[PDB]
């Protein structure tokens, strides 16, 4: 009787593939052929934030585009003032393995997590004047890979136990849990309206979840290996994922299918972080070959490179105003380009 | 050496063509010493990766050699190619004093690099804990200072002449110039402070390192077998042969002069002094250029032409 | 602009304090060696841990004034391709095996292949592996009792002979030690095969309880560091 359901699943997959093929009247390149190229993009470092002891693995910008937060494998969660290079805070972590980092949109709270299964929330502006863990969200059986705030209260975490979760911090219980994936979950991205968010997994598939209802609305299976990074298009109707296939790929949500591929035969290294600019015309990517790239998201041509790191670009992020792009690397440095 | 009244400054018995070639070679030596040390002092400070404490000795042994090339060597270039000072007398003592200071600083930095390597391969677990920035900066300071006092209190205070016959001292002048004169007591004292102690430390510390490397090669070969007799023979041969061949001739001929009343005809003085200076030229060629990491960083400096292979696109 | 200057001086004071604390923490961190306690199933990992004395369990033992970390990665799923990349900065990967589990599924080729996978990983080409082989007593007991089908289960056991340069402790006849030494040329075969000179394997076939078990991790974290230092100086 199991095969009786496998046949129905195969038939439904065939229907989905037929619908996607019917809906692909043309590709992005045929309609972008007659557009002006972005040209060469030369941007050089503007700040180098030093003070970390081990390979920095995460980072996040504040909504004001000035304050920054970075997390390193030495146990330090440092909050920089990127404009002046100053350190506004240095939070000592209980566990030296911190795989994520998140600056709350209001700026009040910060979040970290890693191989300790626990997402620690730090209150930056207690009346006392110091930083103390507001709450340790526990209930994951894997390792936090990326956590992002929806508000000062709620938070969304992705864990290596093949599930995501939406936590209510005021109580510590998982408001909802997302269990659709079949491999690890290695990254996240929240819609500008925050009603949807996508998770990239190690099953070579991205999934789109609705935060309220809590079930995968769509699954995107264009990749062929582990997905290490994911970010939306500023308008929320498309997103881009980087994998160990050594290719970024731009999927769309309303077409429910892959739109474009960004790869080069000379590149076979894995991708570790992707980001867009304030307009979405530049897909920055961070590879394992010590450098980055800047693709014209509509031409798929390499509009530029960012080669100033030594070991690995472990996280990469553009500010909410687009004025800068910070790359935190395994050489224990953040380089703020522009 | 049989002083006189009127010094003959025309003693430059050389043809213009050959003394010009000597100038060309010597200024080549100057340019090499300037450029190599400038590279090893700019690049060790520019890249944030090349900021480990052990690199702040090579970045301070490059400063002494750079200073030696800048404000010392040319004034000996002229003295050697013309046998006549042409820069006065008060610039003489403050020249043969800064020369001693900088030579001793260079050789002391060599000895301290050997000490650092010893604590690096004979106490490895407690290496980064004990070779912290504080101790290494203390080493820099002592190396920079102690020679400074030992030179400016031994030359200015005419203490090298002290304890020796003044007739032989004014005689040892031989028209004066800046022929450095070392009495027996001062000669052996400088031989010990500047060369023998740093040299003995370097030898007694690199013998152990070479023995450890040979033992480690034996173990690795025996284990995982299913080098010019080593990679420790070639590199340590460079590191110690350059130092010996460049420095030992001068000091052996300098402490051996006072006892034997040797006139040391000036050609030997010039050639041995210039071996001494070749040591400062070569220090960066064997302590910073010889090692890959530095070469790779320098290549990354010139990134406007070369493109990395991204691990050479390795594939089975 | 005067309030701007006040805010700038306040931020610089905060930066000075933060940098002082970070310098102290660096003086404490450079003198601390990390480790990892990979357990290939129920192979020791419960008694061996107590001689080095809910995710990463971090213990902090101190041998001869040196500060060793140690990270018993537990509760992590049995899918290591992603979190085994975060332990590339450790000085060693203590790999515990059940050397008596050869003929018991297979816990000796799901751990003998895990070593191969770790060895050839592009991020762990630099991380050495200290290799404990627990239950050697059980292995030898089974071999002496005739339970050893390592001649059909690992049928490449006929051409094998006890290395004439052996060091067999008393009670292990030449034939019984054939097992404990048989699971030393397999991991050593993998190490010899792949090969780069950058990372090394240290086998320590011992029983499930001994005080010579922190003195082995120490004595090999000393040699890993010696070799790493003799290699970065182009010295060997």
């Amino acid at each position, epitope marked *: 009787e199991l095969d009786q359901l496998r046949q129905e699943a195969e038939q439904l997959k065939n229907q989905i593939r037929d619908a996607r093929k019917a809906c692909a009247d043309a590709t992005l390149s045929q309609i972008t052929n007659n557009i002006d190229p972005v040209g060469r993009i030369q941007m050089r470092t503007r700040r180098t934030l030093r003070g970390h002891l081990a390979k920095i693995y995460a980072m996040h910008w504040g909504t004001d585009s000035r304050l920054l937060v970075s997390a390193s494998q030495d146990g330090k969660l440092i909050i920089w003032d990127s404009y002046t290079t100053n350190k506004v805070h240095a939070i000592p972590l209980r566990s030296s393995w911190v795989m994520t980092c998140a600056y709350a949109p209001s700026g009040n709270y910060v979040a970290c997590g890693g191989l300790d299964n626990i997402c620690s929330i730090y209150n930056l502006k207690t009346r006392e004047g110091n930083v103390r863990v507001s709450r340790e969200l526990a209930g994951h059986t894997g390792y936090l890979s990326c956590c992002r705030f929806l508000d000062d209260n709620q938070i969304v975490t992705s864990s290596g136990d093949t599930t995501c979760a939406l936590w209510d911090i005021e109580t510590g219980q998982q408001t909802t849990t997302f269990t659709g994936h079949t491999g690890d979950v290695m990254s996240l991205s929240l819609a500008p309206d925050t009603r949807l968010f996508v998770s990239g997994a190690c*099953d070579a598939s991205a999934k789109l979840w609705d935060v309220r209802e809590g079930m995968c609305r769509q699954t995107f299976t264009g990749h062929e290996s582990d997905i290490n990074a994911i970010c939306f298009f500023p308008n929320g109707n498309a997103f881009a994922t980087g994998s160990d296939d050594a290719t970024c790929r731009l999927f769309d949500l309303r077409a429910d299918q892959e739109l474009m591929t960004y790869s080069h035969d000379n590149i076979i290294c894995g991708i570790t972080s992707v980001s867009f600019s304030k307009s979405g015309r530049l897909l920055l990517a961070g590879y394992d070959d010590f450098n980055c790239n800047v693709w014209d998201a509509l031409k798929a041509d390499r509009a530029g490179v960012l080669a100033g790191h030594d070991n690995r670009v472990s996280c990469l992020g553009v500010t909410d105003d687009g004025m800068a792009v910070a790359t935190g690397s395994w050489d224990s440095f953040l380089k703020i380009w522009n | 050496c049989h002083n006189i009244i009127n010094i003959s400054c025309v003693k430059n018995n050389w043809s213009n063509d050959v003394r010009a070639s000597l100038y060309s070679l010597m200024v080549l030596i100057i340019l090499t010493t300037l450029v190599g040390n400038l590279i090893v002092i700019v690049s060790i400070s520019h890249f944030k990766q090349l900021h480990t404490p052990t690199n702040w000795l090579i970045h301070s042994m490059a400063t002494v050699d750079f200073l030696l090339g800048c404000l010392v060597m040319p004034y000996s270039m002229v003295r050697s190619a013309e046998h006549c000072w042409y820069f006065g007398e008060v610039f003489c003592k403050i020249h043969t004093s800064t020369d001693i200071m900088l030579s001793s600083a260079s050789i002391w930095h060599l000895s301290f690099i050997s000490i650092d390597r010893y604590y690096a391969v004979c106490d490895p677990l407690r290496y980064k804990a004990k070779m912290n920035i504080l101790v290494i900066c203390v080493m820099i300071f002592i190396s920079w200072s102690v020679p400074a006092v030992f030179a400016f209190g031994m030359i200015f205070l005419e203490l090298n002449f002290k304890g020796a016959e003044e007739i032989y001292y004014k005689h040892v002048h031989c028209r004066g110039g800046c022929s450095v004169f070392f009495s027996k007591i001062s000669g052996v004292l400088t031989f010990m402070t500047s060369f023998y102690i740093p040299g003995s430390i370097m030898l007694c510390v690199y013998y152990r390192i070479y023995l450890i490397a040979k033992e480690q090669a034996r173990l690795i070969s025996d284990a995982n077998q299913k080098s010019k007799e080593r990679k420790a023979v070639k590199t340590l041969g460079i590191v110690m042969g350059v130092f010996l061949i460049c420095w030992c001739p001068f000091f052996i001929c300098t402490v051996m002069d006072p006892f034997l009343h040797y006139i040391i005809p000036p050609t030997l003085n010039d050639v041995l002094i210039w071996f001494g200076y070749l040591n400062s030229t070569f220090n960066p060629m064997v302590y910073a250029f010889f090692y890959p990491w530095f070469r790779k960083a320098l290549k990354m400096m010139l990134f406007g032409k070369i493109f990395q292979k991204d691990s050479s696109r390795c594939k089975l | 602009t005067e309030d701007q200057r006040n805010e700038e001086k306040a931020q610089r004071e905060a930066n000075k304090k933060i940098e002082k604390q970070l310098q102290k923490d660096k003086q404490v961190y450079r003198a601390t060696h990390r480790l990892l306690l990979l357990g290939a199933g129920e192979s020791g990992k419960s008694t061996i841990v107590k001689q080095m004395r809910s995710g990463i369990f971090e213990t902090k033992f101190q041998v001869d004034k040196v500060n060793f970390h140690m990270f018993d990665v537990g509760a992590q799923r049995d899918e290591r391709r992603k979190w085994i990349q975060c332990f590339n900065d450790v000085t060693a990967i203590i790999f515990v095996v059940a050397s008596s589990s050869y003929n018991m599924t*297979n816990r000796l080729q*799901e751990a003998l292949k895990l070593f191969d996978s770790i060895w050839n990983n592009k991020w762990l080409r630099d991380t050495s592996v200290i290799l404990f082989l627990n239950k050697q007593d059980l292995l030898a007991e089974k071999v002496l009792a005739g339970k050893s089908k390592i001649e*059909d289960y690992f049928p490449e056991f006929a051409r094998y002979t006890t290395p004439e340069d052996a060091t067999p402790e008393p009670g292990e006849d030449p034939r019984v030690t054939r097992a404990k030494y048989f699971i030393r040329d397999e991991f050593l075969r993998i190490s010899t095969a792949s090969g780069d000179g950058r990372h090394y394997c240290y086998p320590h076939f011992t029983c499930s309880v001994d005080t010579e078990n922190i003195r082995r991790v120490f004595n090999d974290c000393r040699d890993i560091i010696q070799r790493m230092h003799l290699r970065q100086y182009e010295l060997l």
Partner: nanobody, 128 residues
Framework: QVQLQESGGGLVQPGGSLRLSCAAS????????MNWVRQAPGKGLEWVSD????????SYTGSVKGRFTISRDNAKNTLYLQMNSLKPEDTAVYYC?????????????????????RGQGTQVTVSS
């Protein structure tokens, strides 16, 4: 979409011969080292064989070498395991697996319980 489908299986008297074919679609076959693993009835997954990108490097589990022959055809995007002289203990569910990443000699989790790039496998029964 990564999709590995196995064929060949069923009853085979001891000493008989069988052939397992793995058809791989949804990725570039010639870039990934391909493994065959197995799960015996009641036991856990057990690595059986591997084959590297080009087919030059091969390796078997202990109780299999000289008895199974593994090969791959990159032109047809297919993997093959010739099971010769079967024994009763060889009955199991055979799974076709691919290493997680391209251009790597490491193949970490093919034996894991919840691998994503592994096929549904085929049953091999060995008894009269």
């Amino acid at each position: 979409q990564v999709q590995l489908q196995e064929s060949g299986g069923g009853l085979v008297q001891p000493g008989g011969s069988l052939r397992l074919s793995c058809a791989a679609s949804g990725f570039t076959f010639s870039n990934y080292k391909m493994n065959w693993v197995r799960q015996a009835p009641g036991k856990g997954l057990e690595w059986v064989s591997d084959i590297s990108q080009s087919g030059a490097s091969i390796s078997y589990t202990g109780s299999v070498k000289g008895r199974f022959t593994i090969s791959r055809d990159n032109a047809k995007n297919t993997l093959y395991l010739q099971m010769n002289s079967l024994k009763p203990e060889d009955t199991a569910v055979y799974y076709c697996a691919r290493c997680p990443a391209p251009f790597t000699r490491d193949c970490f989790d093919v034996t894991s319980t919840t691998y994503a790039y592994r096929g549904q496998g085929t049953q091999v029964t060995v008894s009269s």
